[PDB]
Amino acid sequence: MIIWPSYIDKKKSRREGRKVPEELAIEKPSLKDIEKALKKLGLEPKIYRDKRYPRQHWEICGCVEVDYKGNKLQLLKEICKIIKGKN
Template sequence: MKEMIIWPAYIDLKRTKNEGRKVPKEFAVQNPKLKDIAGKLKKMGLEYSIEHKKSYPKDPWEICGYIKVKADKRTSKLQILKEICKNMG
């Protein structure tokens, strides 16, 4: 297992790639929330923990939190992000 950090910015439609979005626009969602991401991770059967009082490094003034996910070593972050985005928003 490996741990990875998922910030809401990674799947946020309003962000550009330079602003931190990691998924293509066709997968991105509007205004992603930690609880929605956590709900998707739960449905995916992944173990996770939420860190609420953290700020995204590219926006240090905005406290949005992140989710730490434990995933199989063969699974990429992009695969997980795309799966989170499915049927969301």
């Protein structure tokens, strides 16, 4: 499964790729945070910094690949809650 940072970017609107509602979204989210959250969830994330999201093909944002067999949107919601939840 791929996770594009735009999915949870609070700066982006839905048309631009945000898949998460405003109150969970993270402003300019980091792959370092995305990866940390996924590991906390028992998964094996792998960062690819070279990749660009077609909706913003000029912006070298990278992405995270993790083998996941559950609901995608719901994992994104969980990732966000973990990130906004570091003590």
